[PDB]
Every structure is written in structure tokens, then in C-alpha cells.
RNA sequence: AACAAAAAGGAUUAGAUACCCCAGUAGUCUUUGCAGACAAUUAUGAAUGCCAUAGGUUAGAUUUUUAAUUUAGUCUAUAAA
């Protein structure tokens, strides 16, 4: 019954703009700044592009054409729109290269994302048919639920004392009746197990008496109870009797849609030298030197801890442009908060020399001149 | 804490002192000279370097005025859009 | 299937829903900065702005296009008014097609109600069925008062309301692009659409330009067959009466 | 009343009457304006008549004294819920630029989601996943999660090959004497140098400022 | 979207009588160009190149490494159709002006014949062999032969991806190895830093590809076979191709300055 | 919008219709982009080659040829399907129906209704009508297919004309008395629809248009009526020959 | 305790009851009554039905609680009037 004009808008490109997702979650009790805000952990608005011809006119498929002062001249045309029409009759926009190019930088490292491992390194891919699964069935047993990553219930350890009370009085309290039915289904199957077995050599599931007594038998073994309660509220397992239980489930996909590579078990064949041992190094910056009990380094837009090891010790104003060292990214993963934590590992000497050779800035060429 | 209010309809949105008011520098230098005279004394020896600094300013040429800050022009543009409107 | 300067090199005769939606002719203003009066064209609310119904735009656009055609078919003087940074090429092109007058700057208040002073020195001429000068009206082009547009086609009624008021004050029909926050009672024929878009304005103006062009064509085709689709205006008509009076004296005297 | 009495809707009525008779009683009325006959049979449309707007969602049946009856309603589709879910699971999918500038508007004519994610005219993005998800959920009678899993997994495989081509493309190109320009990584670091040096200057100045400002405390 | 277009003289339905059967031309152009374009469309389905022509994509999408994979499909589609727009249903007689100039740069029509053919087999890889017209500010128009590995653009605006030398066997420890090695790095270092090794006139008019020869496997692996026994094979494919060159059209693109 | 229209009392009936026609075209959303003319091209040509005779026997005989495999027309599927439906209806109605199609082309609108009354009055006494209606709508298709008094057209011998009987008004049924006396031979204003063959023909006999210049003539006269370009193109694909190249276009009939 | 009409002193001033100053009693406060006047004001009696929006704000409610709907108040700026 939709009108033809209303049927075109449903599939229009503008109507496809995703809603502004909540910002990257941070500690609920901090002193965040209000007037000034730095770049976020992950993007929140959709980045836009246009044709080189339509950009010279300021046409971005928006309400009105954007100004040419800050929208033309750059190589990569990227822009974010906070409001298509604000109270000032202007499209409140801003450059989107902060996050747009950071994705391109990270995708130039050629590194997959793997599930974190407690401290024999085992980098298991995130995109697998055994772990990456959201759909389920009620009949499924508790064990497979650990594999999942998208739980409907909240994380108890993460919730604040106020949020916890609200959850109890608005999600758990008005569920006793339904929970009683859930037990009946379990008790029903229990009666069928003995019958089926003896028959080799289900009931209507309506017994309000066994249920009450069934819960009094589990008061001495709280473990099996929580195991059952976690299935009715879809809570992330917390006790070892494990995966991502230290910081809780990932609010997003374990890869967070930043890289879709499954493994890095490849050897880039170099033209002259041949198949190299490790991956090409990457130059990074130095932020917050040791002399804060750790050093921060900027590896392709992201901030990660320095390798476990001058340069990191003290700051040096004389160095122009700042201290820049080469380094190899070993492992990358997404924490519960959504940040992209990189296991930056010190690079080798030959790798840097080989990689600089193509750039043409290598002081001494390994090819030919090198006698030994 | 509440957020900044939406200004009522004003005749003209502007700032009185568009450009900062520059304070005569050595008026402070004179204060130091006067201070030393109070503590040390008028016909003393430690006041030489301070008194000589006061003579240095008057001889030195005054700086040139800064370029006007065009802030009232942009405020007049977005007045009707930022506030409730204009009144007359 | 899309060139930026396609609405100028070859504007379309009629604009379909796709063309109007592709030109952002439905992006209304913010929900807060709306005019409840023109809630008859709004379709819904998305992205915090009012969505103008695509069908409502096409219907009013075709209607206005018919108005421009007839007025040009009856020898009317049309005026295309677009006063914005990037609307100069759009208005000039539309005028060429419809053989009309353009205006891409701040309309001087009092050019219709006080035309005697403003448009005093601008020269005029006298044409005929086939739009060619008629020698013999030299004395009439000095006592004649300036002209007024028989139809104004505004592309930003919200900005310039002094022009549209003189049109209603001087009994002149008008056409305008009414946005979500523009009063629809300022113009005679509304065209609910997005006026802040330089791509929709080029489309709407192109369609109206073709209308005038098609109208002018019919008029000239009917003039070559000895069928004039317009009679002498009242002003010039009076001169003929005076001409015979002065000529009558020569006959007797 | 800051407004003015507009009569743009009555230009024909007023003009038609003024041209009915002559001001000099006892003479034939002069010819009317040239536009009077052009819009004779085209009366203006009705304006300023608040109708019942289109209801895009069931109105609250419990409200006994409803307000805002003449207010346009919000447009919500079933996709909105799905788009929010997906893009929250893949926040870095928003860094992939997406053009919302329609070319001709005829982009929904060749979209058949029964084939797969890849379609004609639209790029592989979260939207294709949602539309594909919605299709499976409706036609194939799948659940929200089930349809989400299937379509989502196809999205991954298509993105993996895309990233593999880039690496293999540049690598293979150099095997036959192919050289490229400055990669994005190197360029990014260069710009930081120019910006970091500017910060050093400002820091040095303000540092010296405080030192000179500390001499006055004593 | 980029869509396949017809061939010059209805070769899709009939094909060249003595060079390629209709079936071979079908699999070579209609069933391959379509595949390449299908991939190309998916790559530029939502970028600035959604409406750009193949050549514009080639030149524009050349230096940037991140878009290397787009260059291949775009360039391949261009070169492929560039190779079919120079054949003819019947052999054409070489133009006089062209015939003369050829001898002045290669010595004879047969000298150039065996050079291009010889270069093909020498490559032992899929590539395109061109016939380029070189010109400099004061130097007269001079022709030369160029070999492009896999997808290689002969134009000077795509020098980054010229791919004229296989680094595998052309860079060793011998005297030639070191020489080739230096050039390889000299180009990379120059290109990376933005320096220009060889000045080129604006508009890329120094080099104008006149004729081409597709040596890819799919083109000839069917009609001429594997080539075991020398009967047919890649060699014969190049030979037969030399008889269908539309020398008339070749002369037109040459645009030789009147000097006779 | 139709309510806003206020015509003048001195406007001719033609003017009033013109205003509405132009107003109804303001709400046109455009014909579908994929749906093609169903009865057009081949199928349309087949209809003119099998529905020009005055006897059902000849008509069905022609369809059988088209249905027979290898027919030049290429409408075999349509032809076969059509026959299946023609052999499932009352044979009496077919003869009677076709009879008035040839006689109704010369009657007036007023005379038509008067004859149809007497014509329909004899159908109430007929057996087919009382049987078909009862066996279809009333029974809701129960008891299987209806049973016409003549089982099939084959039963009706060639030399027998059953059509004539109905076309004889009886004195028992009084002549229909209409509410007025207005009448005519052809519709006064039936030109609002898409151009048909009559319009395209007239245009060619009064002009020197080309294959592409003729389409623009109709698109201009109707000023963008949806489907004019497609309709006119179809007419020029069935009854238009390239007699003098692109210079002129003539009809195939000649 | 403090403040402070009155009474009184010191100044100012042409004169100074005054304004200013040193001090100072009723009174202000507590309990029980009288008294009933106020710019006791929103210069707008109380109450009911009804009329288009926007930006804040107060106490709640609902929700995909991020941010939007919504009930009852309050205050700015407007449309029709
Ligand atoms: K006193
Ligand atoms: K309020
Ligand atoms: Mg606007
Ligand atoms: Mg006191
Ligand atoms: Mg009392
Ligand atoms: Mg009081
Ligand atoms: Mg009272
Ligand atoms: Mg209050
Ligand atoms: Mg007020």
C-alpha cells in the first residue's frame, strides 16, 4: 500500500545512512573534557565520498552544497555529517580522514585479528564456523555457549552498582514466572531419560511440585545453578569452571570490522632477495617515554605499548620530528572496550635495511656492493 | 549542570572590545623603580640598573598597532541563526 | 548516467520522481525550523529533517510548467529570479530558452511599485507577431512607462520577500520553490522542494525553461499562419487611438 | 503583526475584475494583461489547511486525549533495527567511505537479493548485508540471528579476497619491474613531523614564557 | 557500469577466417572481456572511477599501490580490445609513407616482423607486444618495439606499471645483473621520492601505441594448441597475426609528419 | 484538485474536458519500466490476421494454423492458449457475439442500447445462459463444467445461422425508452487516450514525417503523455514500411 | 548580644528638621490576646471548554534507558489572531 514516491525513498542512498552508534565506552567515573574532544577509539559516523567533478561544486548528496574552502584540495575526500540541517540552517559536518585513513593504514599492515590468549602462542582466526556464531537454540547445552561472542545479557562484573540494581528490578525480577516454566522443561526431559534408557534394554512438563523441590536440591551446589541461570538470561560465563572473562564479552564483533584476514601464515616473496623470513617492518613514533611506567608508541595511527626492552628512556628535543623507530607488528586483537590493542615487537636490523632499499634511502645497498 | 541558554533577541550581537587593549609596558617598569626607592632608597646604588631600564623604554619606539579582529562581522551574520532572532 | 552539468547542456522536458529524488528535491529543513502552515507537502521525518513528498513536488512542478508555457504562448514577459552564490548560470540558461529576463542579484526594492524612477533610462522596443521591430513608435518609447514582468519565477522565495510582495501588490502571478520553512502564501503557484540544493534548482529551472521554449515555439508557429495569440496591450492600444486623432487633423487640415 | 497582507492567491480575481469595465464610464474596456488568459483555467492550489498527516507507525490506541495530531510522523522501516545492530558489531565499517550522491535514482531496479550480496550499482557494504538478511528472514522464514549469521559470513569472505588482492597485486607487480609511489603509511608519518615540529616551537616559547614569568614572583 | 561492446567487423559472430575461428574469438574476447569487466565493475562500483573510461582509470590508478589490483583489470581490458581493433578480415597492403618510415627505423619490414615475433617467444610469459612511436622536442619521429609484462601500459603517463623487464632472471650477479639491478632501484627510489628520471612532454605525446599483440595463453591456446612438434603453437599464432594487421589503420594512428 | 477547478459558464464542453485532461496528467507517476505492451507486435498482428472474418469457423481455422508449429508469426504459444479458452465457452454466444461486432460498427449509440435490450431479452429464454450462470456462479463451479445446448461448434452445421434469430425484436417486449434523445455515430471526445492507429495514420497522410521525427510530433502535441513514445513506436512496427528510406514513412496496407 | 524609630550629642550648611558620624530607648525575639489596614501585585478574581510552533527548565513515567516519546508545572521567542 506504499505510495510510489514512498517506495523510492525506502531504498534511497541517504536513507541507508546508519544511525549514530554509541561512542566507544569508557570508564563511567572519569573527568572527560567537554569543550574539547579528541579522536575516538572507533568511528561513529559514516564517511562519505564524491566524484572529482561533483566535489568541485560542493555537491555531496546532502541537503545543501558544502563550502569549497575546507572541502577541496585534499587528496582523499572524506567528510562526516553530524546533522544534515542544524538550528543554524547549515549541515554540521567535519573531516572524516581521521578514521577513514586510519582504516587504510591498518589494512596496509596485512595482519589478521585473533582471539586473545592467556599467558606456546596460538593465533586462532576470528572468522570460523565454530566460534563466530550468534544464533543458537534453547536445546543447546551450556558448553557451546562459551564459543559465542554476542550475548544478550549484560556483564555483571562490568555493570556499576547502580546499573546492577536497575537490571535486577527491571529485567530479572519480572521473570520468575517464565523461569519456573524453563525448569519444567528441564525436569520433563529428566523423566524421559530414565524411561528411554530402560526401554532400550516426554511428559507434558506441568509439575509445580517438583520445581519447588528441585531448586532446594541445588542450594548445596551453587555452580550447577548459575550454569542454568546463565542460559535463561544469556549471561557471559565468568568463572573458569573462561574466554574473555577477564574484561568481559566484546561489545562488538571480535574483529570489529577493521580487518577480515583469517591468517598471516604467508611469506611475501621479495623480487631480488626472495622469500623473506618475517613481515616488512613499520616505522612508529614514541609517546610518553618511560622517564607512567611504560612507553606509548604510535603504530599507524593506533597507540600501543612499547616493546619489552636511548630512545624510550628519555625525551630528546634535539631530535627533529621526534624519535621514530622501526618495529614489527606481531599480534593484533580487540579488547572488550573496542580498542585495537597491538602486540608490537621490536624489529630486526636486516628487515629495516631491506625495506628501506626500495624507498631509495638505504645508505648502503645490499645488492652487489655488499661483499660479505 | 545546565547548558548555555539560547540568547534572547538582541538588537546587535557584538563584543565591545573587539581587539585587546594594550597596556603601556614600562608603566610596570616604573612600579619597580618606585618599589626600589621605597626599600633601598632614592640616592642608592642598586637602583641604577632599575632606573636605567626606565630610561630605556621612553627612548625605544612604541610598537605598531595590530590588525583589527573581524569578529563582529561574523557574529552579525549568525545572529538570527544563533539567537531567537533580531529585535527592532 | 549522471553528469554534473547535465541540467544546463540539456535539461529535461519533465522531471520524474527519480530525477527529483536524485537531485535532493525532498530534503526539507530541520524539524524545529519548520512552518506548520506547509505541513500539507511533508511526507515524514527522517534524519531530523522533514521529507517533502516526491509526488507532491512533481504534481506542482508540472502545474507550474504549464503556467510558464501558456504565459509565454500569450506573449507574456517572464522573469527568472535566482539570487544565490551559484544560481547565476541556472537562471541565465532558463531565460535563454524561454526568451525571458534574468535576475541573479539583490532585487532593488521598488522596481515594480516605483518603476518610473528605477527603470527610467533602460531602453525598450516595439515588436509584432514575429517578434521583429516596428519602426514608427519613436514618440511612444519616451512617454511610455517602464515594463513589469507578467510572471516571476523565483528560486529562493525565503530570501527575497520584497519582490514577491510587489508582485501581489501589483497583481502579478508568481512561481516559487517553497521549502519546509518558507511561507507558502507568498507565491501564487508553489513548488514544494529543496531550495538549498543547487542540483534541484537547476532541474526545476530547466523544466520551466523548456516550458517557455515550447510555448514560444507554438506562438511563433501560430504567427506564421496569420493567427496572433495576443492582442495589443492597453498601453500601446491607447497610442493607436491618439495616432488616429493626430492623423485626423492632417486629413481635415 | 510583523507580517504583511499577501494576496498572491487572488491575483487573477483582482486583476479580472479590474479589467471587467473601464475607468471612463461609457467606453469599451481596454485589453487586459497578456497573462490573464494564460492562467485562466489554472486556479491556484489550496494552501494552509492542516490535514491528518500520514501515520508511518500505529498511533497509541490508549491515548484518550492525543496531542500533535497534525504533526508528521517519523519514518521507521524494519531495516533501521538491523542496520543499528550490524554497524554496532562492525564500527570500523563506517570508516569505509560510502557515497550517498544518487546518479539517476534508478539504483533499486537491478537489486535482486535472492542471488547474493554482490549487486549491480551498489558497493559491498553493511547495507547489502541488511537487505540480504531481511530477504532470508522473510522469504526463507529464517530467524533474525540465523539470517544475520548466513549473510554476515558471506560478507567476510568477499572482504578477505579484496584485502588479499592488494598485497598480491603490489607484490607481483614488482616481480616484473613495477614501482609505486609513497604508501599511505609513509605519507602519514611525514605529516606528523611537520606538525610535531610546530608543537616543539610552541612548547619552547611557552616554556621560556613561564621562566620569565617566574622571575617576577621573587 | 562498464559494459562489453561489439567488435570491429563482426568478428564475434564470424571471426577472422584464417587467424581465429569464431569459437576461439568468442572465448578470447566475449567470454574473457566480460569476466574482466565484471570484476572491474565490482571494484569501481562505488568510487570516482564508476564512470571513468578504462584509459583514464589506467593512467589515474597507476602510481597508487593501494589500487594496484584495479589497474590490472582496467589495463587488461584496454589492451585486449586494443589488440582486436587493429586486425582486418582481409590482409591490407602496407601504406607507402608507413612502409618507408619502417625501413628507416628497422631496416626492413621483415626485420621488424621477426623482432616482434622473436620478442614474443623470448618472453615465455603472458604479455603484450607493442609498436610505439617515439618523439622528442627536436628529434624526428622514430619508431621502436616495446614488450609489456602481464598488464603493462605503454603510455608515458603509466610509467610506474610499464613492467618491461622480468626481475626474476634479469637481476643476477653478472655484469648485466648489476646494471639491471641499479636501474630497478633507481626507478623505485626516483618514483617513490617523486623525482623524474626521464623528462616527458606534457600530455603524454612522446609515445603513441600504434599496434599491439596479445600473447596471453587464453588467446591462442585453443586454435593453435600447445605447440608440441612446432606445428602451430604460440609461434604460429604470432606469424598468422602478422598477415591480418590493418596497416591502413596502423598508418592513421602513426600520424607521421609529411617528410617525403 | 478537481474540486478547485471552477469553469466559466461560457466555456464550451471541449474546454472543460481540456482542463481536466491537463489536470489528470499532473499526477502521472510514469508507466512501469519493465512491463512491455502485452497485445503488441507479433500478438497484435496475429489478432488482425485471425479476427477479420465473419464466421467463427474461419477464425478458429486461422488460429489452428498459427498454433501449428513452425508458423511464421511466432505466436504459437498464444495461439494454442487462445484456442483452449475458445473451446470452453458457449458456442451460441460466440456466433451471436461476433455477429454484433460487425453490425455494431454502423449502429448509433442510442440504437445500440435499444437493440441490446431486445437482444438480451432473448438470452433470458435461451438455455445456455440459464445453464452457464447456474453451473458457474451459483454452484461455485461444483458439478463440473457447464453443458451448453450445442456441445461444440462442430455440432452446428455450416449452413445454419443461429445469429439471425436474436436480432429480431419481438412485439411482446416494448422498445427501450431512454431518458433523452441525444445520440451519435462515433464518440464525440474519445481522443484523450494514447494515440491509436487512426491517429498515426492521419498524421502520415497530412505530413512528411520520418521514423524518428514522427514520434516527436506526437510527443510534442501531447506534451509528455506517459507511454506515447512507446505506443507510437509500436504502431510504426506493425503498419509502417520504409518505403523511401528515412526520408518518408508509408503504411504497409497501400 | 546585635540592630534600631524616639530623645540627645558631633559635623556639614546661608540655614539642616535632615542625608553622614559617636552613642542610644521603645521595638524586632519568646508566651497569651487584641488589632485586620499593605505596590496583601501577575497593577491581570476563581473555574470550565477550546487554538499553531520552537528553545530552555522543574518532579515523574515509558522506551532499542545512548537518546527520544509523554503527563503535570514554570519561563523566554513567535504564528494565526
Ligand atoms: K543634630
Ligand atoms: K515545557
Ligand atoms: Mg531553504
Ligand atoms: Mg547603632
Ligand atoms: Mg483575629
Ligand atoms: Mg506582602
Ligand atoms: Mg472569591
Ligand atoms: Mg517556579
Ligand atoms: Mg511571551
mmCIF file of N, CA, C and O in Angstrom, chain C residues 13-14 16-18 40 55 58-60 62-63 66 69-70 214 217-218, chain F residues 1 4 18-19 22-23 25-30 33 220 223-226:
data_model
loop_
_atom_site.group_PDB
_atom_site.id
_atom_site.type_symbol
_atom_site.label_atom_id
_atom_site.label_comp_id
_atom_site.label_asym_id
_atom_site.label_seq_id
_atom_site.Cartn_x
_atom_site.Cartn_y
_atom_site.Cartn_z
ATOM 1 N N UNK C 13 12.501 17.736 -20.343
ATOM 2 C CA UNK C 13 11.182 18.329 -20.529
ATOM 3 C C UNK C 13 10.343 18.188 -19.266
ATOM 4 O O UNK C 13 9.737 19.158 -18.798
ATOM 5 N N UNK C 14 10.290 16.982 -18.708
ATOM 6 C CA UNK C 14 9.569 16.714 -17.475
ATOM 7 C C UNK C 14 10.487 15.982 -16.509
ATOM 8 O O UNK C 14 11.355 15.206 -16.917
ATOM 9 N N UNK C 16 10.851 13.324 -13.520
ATOM 10 C CA UNK C 16 10.219 12.192 -12.868
ATOM 11 C C UNK C 16 10.603 12.154 -11.392
ATOM 12 O O UNK C 16 11.408 12.953 -10.907
ATOM 13 N N UNK C 17 10.010 11.207 -10.663
ATOM 14 C CA UNK C 17 10.317 11.072 -9.244
ATOM 15 C C UNK C 17 11.795 10.782 -9.024
ATOM 16 O O UNK C 17 12.411 11.321 -8.097
ATOM 17 N N UNK C 18 12.381 9.930 -9.865
ATOM 18 C CA UNK C 18 13.798 9.613 -9.735
ATOM 19 C C UNK C 18 14.654 10.865 -9.865
ATOM 20 O O UNK C 18 15.566 11.096 -9.062
ATOM 21 N N UNK C 40 1.254 20.285 4.514
ATOM 22 C CA UNK C 40 0.473 19.551 3.532
ATOM 23 C C UNK C 40 1.341 18.813 2.527
ATOM 24 O O UNK C 40 0.848 17.902 1.855
ATOM 25 N N UNK C 55 5.907 12.971 -4.838
ATOM 26 C CA UNK C 55 4.762 13.137 -5.724
ATOM 27 C C UNK C 55 4.203 14.549 -5.638
ATOM 28 O O UNK C 55 3.796 15.126 -6.653
ATOM 29 N N UNK C 58 6.380 16.737 -7.900
ATOM 30 C CA UNK C 58 6.166 16.525 -9.327
ATOM 31 C C UNK C 58 4.842 17.119 -9.784
ATOM 32 O O UNK C 58 4.763 17.729 -10.856
ATOM 33 N N UNK C 59 3.790 16.948 -8.985
ATOM 34 C CA UNK C 59 2.483 17.478 -9.355
ATOM 35 C C UNK C 59 2.523 18.995 -9.478
ATOM 36 O O UNK C 59 2.059 19.561 -10.473
ATOM 37 N N UNK C 60 3.071 19.672 -8.471
ATOM 38 C CA UNK C 60 3.132 21.127 -8.516
ATOM 39 C C UNK C 60 4.094 21.616 -9.590
ATOM 40 O O UNK C 60 3.877 22.684 -10.173
ATOM 41 N N UNK C 62 4.799 20.132 -12.592
ATOM 42 C CA UNK C 62 4.125 20.034 -13.881
ATOM 43 C C UNK C 62 3.086 21.134 -14.039
ATOM 44 O O UNK C 62 2.908 21.682 -15.132
ATOM 45 N N UNK C 63 2.387 21.466 -12.955
ATOM 46 C CA UNK C 63 1.400 22.537 -13.000
ATOM 47 C C UNK C 63 2.059 23.875 -13.308
ATOM 48 O O UNK C 63 1.607 24.616 -14.187
ATOM 49 N N UNK C 66 3.147 24.187 -16.819
ATOM 50 C CA UNK C 66 2.055 24.541 -17.718
ATOM 51 C C UNK C 66 1.760 26.031 -17.662
ATOM 52 O O UNK C 66 1.376 26.625 -18.675
ATOM 53 N N UNK C 69 4.379 27.884 -19.746
ATOM 54 C CA UNK C 69 4.183 27.679 -21.175
ATOM 55 C C UNK C 69 3.104 28.606 -21.718
ATOM 56 O O UNK C 69 3.314 29.309 -22.713
ATOM 57 N N UNK C 70 1.938 28.623 -21.071
ATOM 58 C CA UNK C 70 0.835 29.439 -21.565
ATOM 59 C C UNK C 70 1.190 30.918 -21.544
ATOM 60 O O UNK C 70 0.914 31.645 -22.506
ATOM 61 N N UNK C 214 8.968 25.765 -25.320
ATOM 62 C CA UNK C 214 7.883 25.116 -26.045
ATOM 63 C C UNK C 214 6.734 26.085 -26.286
ATOM 64 O O UNK C 214 6.086 26.043 -27.338
ATOM 65 N N UNK C 217 7.665 28.528 -29.070
ATOM 66 C CA UNK C 217 7.630 27.856 -30.363
ATOM 67 C C UNK C 217 6.222 27.861 -30.942
ATOM 68 O O UNK C 217 6.021 28.188 -32.117
ATOM 69 N N UNK C 218 5.230 27.494 -30.128
ATOM 70 C CA UNK C 218 3.853 27.467 -30.610
ATOM 71 C C UNK C 218 3.401 28.850 -31.056
ATOM 72 O O UNK C 218 2.774 28.999 -32.112
ATOM 73 N N UNK F 1 -8.022 18.484 -6.315
ATOM 74 C CA UNK F 1 -7.752 19.418 -7.401
ATOM 75 C C UNK F 1 -8.978 19.597 -8.282
ATOM 76 O O UNK F 1 -9.313 20.721 -8.671
ATOM 77 N N UNK F 4 -11.213 22.230 -7.065
ATOM 78 C CA UNK F 4 -10.771 23.611 -7.201
ATOM 79 C C UNK F 4 -11.132 24.177 -8.565
ATOM 80 O O UNK F 4 -11.407 25.376 -8.685
ATOM 81 N N UNK F 18 -10.672 19.739 -21.765
ATOM 82 C CA UNK F 18 -9.248 20.013 -21.921
ATOM 83 C C UNK F 18 -8.596 20.318 -20.581
ATOM 84 O O UNK F 18 -7.491 19.843 -20.294
ATOM 85 N N UNK F 19 -9.267 21.113 -19.748
ATOM 86 C CA UNK F 19 -8.708 21.485 -18.453
ATOM 87 C C UNK F 19 -8.503 20.251 -17.587
ATOM 88 O O UNK F 19 -7.464 20.099 -16.934
ATOM 89 N N UNK F 22 -5.598 17.993 -18.812
ATOM 90 C CA UNK F 22 -4.305 18.533 -18.413
ATOM 91 C C UNK F 22 -4.085 18.407 -16.914
ATOM 92 O O UNK F 22 -2.937 18.370 -16.458
ATOM 93 N N UNK F 23 -5.165 18.348 -16.135
ATOM 94 C CA UNK F 23 -5.031 18.230 -14.689
ATOM 95 C C UNK F 23 -4.764 16.789 -14.270
ATOM 96 O O UNK F 23 -4.017 16.547 -13.316
ATOM 97 N N UNK F 25 -3.086 14.696 -15.920
ATOM 98 C CA UNK F 25 -1.714 14.391 -16.295
ATOM 99 C C UNK F 25 -0.699 14.974 -15.325
ATOM 100 O O UNK F 25 0.491 14.660 -15.437
ATOM 101 N N UNK F 26 -1.134 15.807 -14.381
ATOM 102 C CA UNK F 26 -0.222 16.358 -13.389
ATOM 103 C C UNK F 26 0.110 15.355 -12.296
ATOM 104 O O UNK F 26 1.110 15.534 -11.593
ATOM 105 N N UNK F 27 -0.698 14.309 -12.141
ATOM 106 C CA UNK F 27 -0.486 13.292 -11.124
ATOM 107 C C UNK F 27 0.118 12.015 -11.693
ATOM 108 O O UNK F 27 0.174 11.002 -10.990
ATOM 109 N N UNK F 28 0.565 12.039 -12.944
ATOM 110 C CA UNK F 28 1.133 10.849 -13.562
ATOM 111 C C UNK F 28 2.480 10.528 -12.930
ATOM 112 O O UNK F 28 3.383 11.370 -12.911
ATOM 113 N N UNK F 29 2.610 9.311 -12.408
ATOM 114 C CA UNK F 29 3.855 8.853 -11.811
ATOM 115 C C UNK F 29 4.762 8.141 -12.806
ATOM 116 O O UNK F 29 5.923 7.871 -12.480
ATOM 117 N N UNK F 30 4.276 7.859 -14.011
ATOM 118 C CA UNK F 30 5.069 7.174 -15.011
ATOM 119 C C UNK F 30 4.738 5.700 -15.089
ATOM 120 O O UNK F 30 4.575 5.039 -14.059
ATOM 121 N N UNK F 33 8.716 0.480 -15.887
ATOM 122 C CA UNK F 33 9.884 0.470 -16.756
ATOM 123 C C UNK F 33 10.129 -0.882 -17.407
ATOM 124 O O UNK F 33 10.748 -0.937 -18.475
ATOM 125 N N UNK F 220 5.187 15.849 -28.818
ATOM 126 C CA UNK F 220 5.080 17.292 -28.654
ATOM 127 C C UNK F 220 3.626 17.733 -28.542
ATOM 128 O O UNK F 220 3.291 18.564 -27.692
ATOM 129 N N UNK F 223 2.569 16.788 -25.282
ATOM 130 C CA UNK F 223 3.460 17.359 -24.273
ATOM 131 C C UNK F 223 3.698 16.382 -23.122
ATOM 132 O O UNK F 223 3.322 16.610 -21.973
ATOM 133 N N UNK F 224 4.337 15.268 -23.470
ATOM 134 C CA UNK F 224 4.870 14.361 -22.472
ATOM 135 C C UNK F 224 3.873 13.437 -21.815
ATOM 136 O O UNK F 224 4.028 13.118 -20.633
ATOM 137 N N UNK F 225 2.852 12.992 -22.541
ATOM 138 C CA UNK F 225 1.956 11.981 -22.000
ATOM 139 C C UNK F 225 2.684 10.647 -21.899
ATOM 140 O O UNK F 225 3.263 10.165 -22.876
ATOM 141 N N UNK F 226 2.653 10.057 -20.708
ATOM 142 C CA UNK F 226 3.375 8.817 -20.458
ATOM 143 C C UNK F 226 2.894 7.710 -21.388
ATOM 144 O O UNK F 226 1.691 7.467 -21.516
#
